[PDB]
Structure formats: structure tokens, C-alpha cells
């Protein structure tokens, strides 16, 4: 929580007028910027905006080489720019994105007030992405769709994991426990020692003990984008994604990729301009042989003969 409020005092009559004039001057702002939607060149240090999606589940498919690929399906319902931040008023440039849809009578008036004032639907989630220059700002209302990504790139995913409840040390931290037999008495699954004696004389912070487990923010890096379906706003990603079904997931261009890789992919920047409806379904192509080890010695073999 917060600390108790500090006392306040009225200002002397010889200083009150001066303070108010200066405070008002600092709080006076100029006109809001008007972003323009136009393609821009990509520079060595230039970050794009992400997107807010919903986790659907897992499936599998076979690729051109006949290999089974596990996939996770992400759906983008409706993602729009709902606000902007700029240096004059906030000190830095950022873009605010919202997704989802809720009914007016199920949210607080404070939340609904912001969206109604700009003629936007009340959205369930809101998240901010920081940009590098004012020219990277997007006009309010712009849609972020599945066409924002290029099939075959790498992405990062973030979300809250599945709740597990109150769990012990063996399941929560992987402690070994104690023997099942040979005289053990009522301590099969207990953590054992938690300290020493008079020195140091206390228990250290963050000592591993039982507690609640499963609802925390986690990020997976370097996942591969396998298939894209712009018309239905679907993304197929190889690997596991944190969270249960319906979890809110943030998708971003992976930081593991170098500038050269981004140039080769020719990623849209600032975003895709056009109608995503008239786009086909694409599957990435891998120029690799998963069965090369049967023709050439590339595998791991520790023994040297002779």
C-alpha cells in the first residue's frame, strides 16, 4: 500500500500568486500531434509495435519433409490504437493499443469515459508500446491485424501462466525429499533444514518454501511463426505458449533477430497498409534437411576408435 499522507499548509499571501502563475505555465500544452500513415524506411535501431491476441489451443501438422510440427493457435479479435504519448506532455513517445470488447454497464465509469470521449468501443485490455521517434506514431483508430507479421520470422510471447494453487517444495521447487523407508518418521515430503545455528541466526530472504504457484508473468523468446491466415486473423506458432485457453498474449518481434535478418524479411513499417481480406494463407519454407545425419556424420559421438 501507500504511506500515510503528508501534511499540507496554505501558502503565504506574498507567494501564492507567483506559485499559481508558474504552475499553470508549466501545465499549458500545445496542439496534439497528428500522425500520418505512410511507409517509412527501417533503421538499425527501430522498434515496431506488438499486438494483443487470445490463446486458442494446440494442434499439429506435417511439413513438406513429412515431420510432425506441434502448433499453438493465436487469434486476433480487434486491436486498435487508442491513444498516444509524446515528449511535450509525457517526456517520451509511445503508442497505446487496446483489444477486446465489453458492455458499457459492466465496467467502471472511469474506464468507459476515456473510450466514449473519442468514439471508440470499450476494450477489455490496454497495453503500451514505446516508439523511437514521433514519425513512428500511428493515427488513433488504426487496426493491427495478422498481416503485421511476415511468415517465417521469430516472435516473443508473454502472458500469465496457469494457476496451480498451494503447492509444496517437491512440486514447486523440485526438492528431493527424504527416504520412504529405513526409519523415516513423518518427514517424507518436508523441506528439511532451513538454516544453521546461532550464526547467522536467521533465515535469508527468498528462501524456498511452500506457497501459491502458477499465476505469474513469463516470456518465451525465439518462437517460429509457421503459418499466417490474414483473412481470419490467425497465427500459428511452433512451440509452447504460457497460459491456459483464453489467456491474453502479447506478440512482438523477437530481440534475438539481428538487423540484417529484419531487412531480409522486409517487415512492414510502421505497419501494413492495405486490406488484409484479399490475402492468401502462407506457410514458411525451410531449406534444411532433417535427415542429413543419415548421409553425413554430423551427430554427437564421444568415442574415438583405435
Amino acid at each position: 500500500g501507500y504511506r500515510p499522507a503528508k501534511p499540507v499548509y496554505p501558502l503565504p499571501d506574498s507567494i501564492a500568486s507567483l506559485v499559481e502563475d508558474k504552475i499553470a505555465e508549466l501545465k499549458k500544452f500545445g496542439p496534439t500531434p497528428e500522425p500520418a500513415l505512410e511507409p517509412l524506411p527501417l533503421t538499425p535501431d527501430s522498434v515496431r509495435v506488438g499486438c494483443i491476441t487470445v490463446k486458442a489451443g494446440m494442434t499439429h501438422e506435417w511439413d513438406e519433409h513429412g515431420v510432425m510440427i506441434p502448433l499453438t493457435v493465436l487469434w486476433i479479435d480487434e486491436c486498435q490504437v487508442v491513444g498516444l504519448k509524446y515528449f511535450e506532455k509525457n517526456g517520451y513517445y509511445a503508442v497505446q493499443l487496446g483489444a477486446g470488447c465489453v458492455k458499457q454497464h459492466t465496467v467502471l465509469p472511469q474506464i468507459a469515459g476515456y473510450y466514449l470521449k473519442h468514439d471508440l468501443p470499450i476494450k477489455r485490455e490496454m497495453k503500451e508500446y514505446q516508439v523511437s521517434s514521433p514519425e513512428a506514431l500511428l493515427p488513433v483508430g488504426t487496426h493491427i491485424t495478422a498481416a503485421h507479421f511476415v511468415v517465417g520470422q521469430q516472435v516473443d510471447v508473454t502472458g500469465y501462466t496457469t494457476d496451480k494453487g498451494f503447492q509444496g517444495v517437491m512440486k514447486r521447487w523440485g526438492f528431493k525429499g527424504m527416504p520412504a523407508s529405513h526409519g523415516v518418521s513423518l518427514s517424507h515430503r518436508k523441506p528439511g533444514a532451513t538454516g544453521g545455528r546461532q550464526d547467522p541466526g536467521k533465515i535469508w530472504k527468498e528462501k524456498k518454501l511452500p506457497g501459491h504457484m502458477g499465476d505469474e508473468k513469463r516470456t518465451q523468446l525465439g518462437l517460429e511463426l509457421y503459418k499466417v491466415d490474414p483473412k481470419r486473423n490467425l497465427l500459428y506458432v511452433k512451440g509452447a505458449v504460457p497460459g491456459p485457453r483464453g489467456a491474453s498474449i502479447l506478440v512482438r518481434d523477437s530481440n534475438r533477430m539481428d538487423y540484417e535478418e529484419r531487412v531480409a524479411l522486409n517487415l512492414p513499417y510502421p505497419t501494413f497498409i492495405g486490406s488484409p481480406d484479399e490475402l492468401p494463407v502462407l506457410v514458411r519454407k525451410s531449406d534444411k534437411d532433417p535427415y542429413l545425419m543419415y548421409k553425413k556424420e554430423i551427430d554427437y559421438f564421444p568415442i574415438k576408435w583405435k
Partner: protein, 121 residues
Amino acid sequence: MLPNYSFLKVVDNSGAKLVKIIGFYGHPGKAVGVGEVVKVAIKEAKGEKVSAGEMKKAVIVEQKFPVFRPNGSHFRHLRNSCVLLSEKGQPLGNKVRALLTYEFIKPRWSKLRTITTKKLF
């Protein structure tokens, strides 16, 4: 998936019948499978080439644990067996009564691929 100190049946004609794993090579983990080379001790042998109490190298050829392929399928045997090898990496026999699988299509197992009777590929 065979842990250390497991018993194996010999499927070559070198004379050995029963061996026990006593060590691993490299860093294979806590268990070994088909295609790995291990160190074994001979427990029961009837022949002049080998005798009980010796230590030899061997290669795992069959196992009861599932062996997974990239296409999603797997197969299983009903026994665990191995073939004894020399220090130069060659078999100590000339006839192997076992079913060779895809693991031995690799170039380093040419000799085994010649003396084996039945092959799955």
C-alpha cells in the same frame, strides 16, 4: 532407455551370452538407448574368444522402450540386446541374429550392416 547396471543379451556368435553395463562414455544422461556404445562385463560365456570376468565394449541394438521417429511414429522390441565390439570399433563375431533398424544406416556401421541377417530398411 537403459539405466546403468542393466543386463543385456548378446546376439552375436562370439560366445558371450549375458553382460552387464558398468559404465558410459561422454555425456549421454542417466540412460542410454539404441546406437550408443557402453562398457560391459561378461557374466556368462561359453567359448574361447571371450571368458567370464572380462570387460568389453558393446553397442545397443534392441530395446523394449519406445524409439521415436521425426514423423511421429515409434516402435518397440521385446528384448534388450547388444553386440560386442573391439577396441578398433569392429564386431568380435561374423553373424548377428537381430533386426537392424534405421539407426544403423549411418556410415559408421557398415560392418554391422553386412553381417546382419534381417534388416528393417
